[PDB]
Write a structure and sequence with these properties.
Elements lengths: L1 E6 L9 H9 L4 E7 L4 E6 L6 H9 L7 E2 L3
Helix pairs in contact: 1-2
PDB class: chaperone
Keywords: M-X-C-X-X-C motif, beta-alpha-beta-beta-alpha-beta secondary structure, copper chaperone, chaperone
Assembly: monomeric
Length: 73
């Protein structure tokens, strides 16, 4: 249950903001998915216990490829 920022790199055209969301949004263990790569932030609260931040980021890579990594605790 950890409110983190999966630092996104904006590399696509328009269909990306949501891709980067939905991926993490698929996780049963997610809680919040405030995607704003345009603002240079994504406030993603997710359950590190069951699915670590890595798993969540890799879940972005399953679809998109716009996940630098967790910027800050």
């Amino acid at each position: 249950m950890e409110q983190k920022t999966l630092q996104v790199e904006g590399m696509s055209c328009q269909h990306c903001v949501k891709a980067v969301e939905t991926s993490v949004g698929e996780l049963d263990g997610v809680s919040a998915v405030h995607v704003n790569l345009e603002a240079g932030k994504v406030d993603v609260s997710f359950d590190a216990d069951k699915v670590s931040v890595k798993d969540i980021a890799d879940a972005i890579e399953d679809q998109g490829y716009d996940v630098a990594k967790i910027e800050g605790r």
